Amino acid sequence: GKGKPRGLNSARKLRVHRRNNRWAENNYKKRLLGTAFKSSPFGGSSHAKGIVLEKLGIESKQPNSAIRKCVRVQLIKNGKKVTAFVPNDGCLNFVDENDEVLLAGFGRKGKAKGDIPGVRFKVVKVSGVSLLALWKEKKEKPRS
Amino acid sequence: WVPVTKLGRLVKAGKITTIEEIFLHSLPVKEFQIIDTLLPGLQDEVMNIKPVQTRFKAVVVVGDSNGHVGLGIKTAKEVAGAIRAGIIIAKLSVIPIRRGYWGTNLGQPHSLATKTTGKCGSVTVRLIPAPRGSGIVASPAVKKLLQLAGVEDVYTQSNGKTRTLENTLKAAFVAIGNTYGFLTPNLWAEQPLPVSPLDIYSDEASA
Amino acid sequence: PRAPRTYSKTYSTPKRPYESSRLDAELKLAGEFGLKNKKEIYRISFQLSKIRRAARDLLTRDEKDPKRLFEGNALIRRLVRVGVLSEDKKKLDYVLALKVEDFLERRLQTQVYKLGLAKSVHHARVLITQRHIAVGKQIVNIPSFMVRLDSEKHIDFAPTSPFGGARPGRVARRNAARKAEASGE
RNA sequence: UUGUAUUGGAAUGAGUACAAUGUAAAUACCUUAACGAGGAACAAUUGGAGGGCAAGUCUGGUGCCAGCAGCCGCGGUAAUUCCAGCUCCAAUAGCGUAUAUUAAAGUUGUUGCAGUUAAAAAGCUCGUAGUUGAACUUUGGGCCCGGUUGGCCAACGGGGCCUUU
RNA sequence: CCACUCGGCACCUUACGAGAAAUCAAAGUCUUUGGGUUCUGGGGGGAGUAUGGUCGCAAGGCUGAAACUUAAAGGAAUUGAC
């Protein structure tokens, strides 16, 4: 019964069978193939730094209605091109082209978050100062 | 009160004095005042209320922390009405529980005597005896039922779609009821069969 | 390089963060015994967890197994010495029934209140931290010090403080001087 | 004997410092003369208040926009979710975010899953490696020694000999 | 024609049981979890596509991905608007 061998000397078939079936687990397969090195923009790191190319607004998905604020960024270590979200409303005035920004993942392990189509990353720091400190008026940003 | 059933008359007359007689002879109970007098320490807890289309459905548990527990579900058109009627149904369903020792028999039972399981819908609940000072290792809803029964230490495991609340309570209620079904070697002895009280006091009960 | 220094963490966090019934029971303990943190409660439940684990293991061994006799008796001996376990309950099955309040009862902060000396658990804590209490000859300034049964006879004010027999403190001295200066007009 | 607000003496180290101690010489810790609290300004933060999940029918603003939102969702004057002010909650010298990994996961299953209709029994039969495979051969009965535990005696362990051996 | 028996395609009755239910002589003897043994699945799309191999005169068969994208897709059974 139960469709699997029970015999006392059947250990070889049991372990070989498990190896074949682990390839259906989604995160197991990612490790063993090394997908994060060969592809995806951060080559497996938690953060990356880039140069701002241009400023964009993204229309939210229906049923919500908003024009959300984003930037195009080129990553320094790869040259790959990416779009990032800028949190906290008026903070978009703190970023301008050829600024240098630090980016982080948008919390969903490579999926897009909420209303925003195709945006996977958010800005953390610009020109070496954190956006949270600027928004709360705790520090000042030098131009260049 | 004015009892209407034969058993109610004997209870009000004081011929029957403990609920253990009723369980021993497996008699039916129809009048909630019977429980209300034999078992006065009973207290109640309200587990859930939700509106439905408007009506209200209420889930109620009653017990005393000393070996008796009951469960009841009622739908009514008023919140106070659902709770009121819910308590009546729960009192009628009261059943006894068998509890024992995890190891050596020092100083009063504190856990279950055996492993037991119950099932309702997809949900299954399993109860395992535990050593002293473990407490009740269960989710909050099931934990409350086991407290009112008076269990101190027990492990639990479960399977199925436990997020459907009333299937989970019914399954747990079945599991603790099964504790008296399991024959064990200290129950192998032979007993004479008692005479029913409805025989002895037949003329007190009539008319 | 030199050998590594060993160290370990001494507390554990509850696994459900916002359980209303737990939150109330903890605040009653903090108010009764004058604690400052939930961490001070997590420390005690962490200790008790290890004690139960050890005892629960030994109880699976056969009676008269030599290890159960040797390590079991040591564990009991040790809990009686601090007064957490009553000398009547001197059996491994009663160790499993201990609870958090039995340990809190033995802290120096609460003993200094039961003896007199202080008029609240909040007054007691300040006296200890301000170096007024001695245990035997030694000044002790840690509130969580566990008082062994032999030590209770020897709790008293320290010799080098007011209340204990020394000179008045800095503020008392200042006032007497200023008054004398005005009176010594 | 318990709360809410006008008033009074006490206690103390953060810090500074003669000295001694420490040290190869020093710095710091431990000790100590003098000095060092009344918004004790000698002013604790970091995240939240629709649900999951502890905690607001409060008050002003705004216009599906700016924004919030892990998920379900909120917002088009009448905002329990945006922005600000009060109040409240949680952990606390620490608290939040990103990425990886463990538990939750009986969603990798030996213990321990599923395959009529929800993902999944190969058109059919033969057949090598592999895994798996019915019953039977000394059993019983006596006699001594015999250690441990429990209250002479009972239980549990063990040795020797005889019985076709 | 009557009685009995072995083997087969089906039927009626029965539920200690099983199941989400419809239902089931096996879809039973499973949290009281172990009679022997072979194959297959792991949310929905992209896709039975691309690429390599192999078989075929050809049409085609067998083996068979990833980047990317999304909060559902799906089963059984109740009540009943204009």
Nucleotide nearest to A44 (CA to C1'): D99
Resolution for this model in angstroms, one decimal place?
2.7
The whole-angstrom separation of Cα B78 and Cα C154 is 67
SS3 labels along B95-122: EECCEECCCCCCCCCCEECCCEEEEECC
Q: How many CB atoms lie within 10 A of CB B164?
A: 13
Task: Convert B92-103 to b/e letters by CB count within 10 Å (16 or more is b).
Answer: eebbbbbbebbe
Q: Which residues of B touch C93 (CB under 8 A)?
A: 104, 106, 132
Between helix B165-177 and helix B140-149 the angle, nearest 10°, is 30
Residue B137, classed as helix, strand or coil, is strand
Note the maximum CA span of chain B: 56
Tokens of B64: 């005393």
For residue A50, count CB atoms less than 10 angstroms from its CB and return exposed for 0-12, middle for 13-18, buried for 19 or more: buried
Distance between alpha carbon A21 and the CA centroid of its chain, in Å?
A: 29
Number of domains in chain A: 1
Q: What is the DSSP letter of C151?
A: G
The whole-angstrom separation of Cα C48 and Cα C39 is 14
Q: In what order do the strands lie in the sheet with B116-120?
A: B116-120, B123-129, B154-159, B136-137
> Whose CA is closest to A102, among A142, A24, A55, A47?
A47
Q: Which residues of B touch C59 (CB under 8 A)?
A: 103, 131
Q: Which residue of C has its CA nearest to B152?
A: C97
> Whose CA is closest to A119, among A74, A72, A77, A75?
A72
> Whose CA is closest to A93, among A135, A44, A124?
A135
* Structure obtained using: cryo-EM
The whole-angstrom separation of Cα C46 and Cα C40 is 10
Asked whether residue A117, judged by its CB, lies under 7 Å from any atom of the DNA or RNA strand D, the reply is no
Strand D, nucleotides < 7 Å from a protein CB: these are 9-13, 32, 35-36, 47, 53-55, 64-76, 89-93, 97-101, 106-111, 113-115, 121, 130-133
Asked whether residue C165, judged by its CB, lies under 7 Å from any atom of the DNA or RNA strand D, the reply is no
Whether omega before A63 lies within 30 degrees of 0, making that bond cis, reads yes
Residue B9, classed as helix, strand or coil, is helix
Tokens of B74: 């009622």
Tokens of A101: 């920004």
Instruction: Spell out the alpha helix ranges (H) of chain A.
Output: 11-22, 26-33, 35-38, 131-135
Instruction: Say whether residue B103 is in contact with chain C using an 8 A CB cutoff.
Output: yes
Range of the domain at A70: 1-144
Sequence letter at residue C19:
E
The whole-angstrom separation of Cα C77 and Cα C80 is 5
Q: Which residue of B has its CA nearest to C98?
A: B133
User: Any idea of the CA torsion for C62, B113, B46, B59, to the nearest 10 degrees?
Assistant: 130
Q: What is the DSSP letter of C107?
A: B
Q: In what order do the strands lie in the sheet with B95-96?
A: B43-52, B55-64, B68-76, B95-96
DSSP H/E element including A75: strand A67-75
Please report, in angstroms and rounded to a whole number, the separation of the first and last CA atoms in chain C.
Answer: 70
Rg of chain C taking only CA atoms, in angstroms: 22
Sequence letter at residue A125:
K
Please report, in angstroms and rounded to a whole number, the separation of the first and last CA atoms in chain A.
Answer: 75
Tokens of B14: 């004081």
Residue B138, classed as helix, strand or coil, is coil
Note the maximum CA span of chain C: 87
> Whose CA is closest to C84, among C100, C102, C107, C72?
C102
The whole-angstrom separation of Cα C84 and Cα C90 is 11
Asked whether residue C159, judged by its CB, lies under 7 Å from any atom of the DNA or RNA strand D, the reply is no
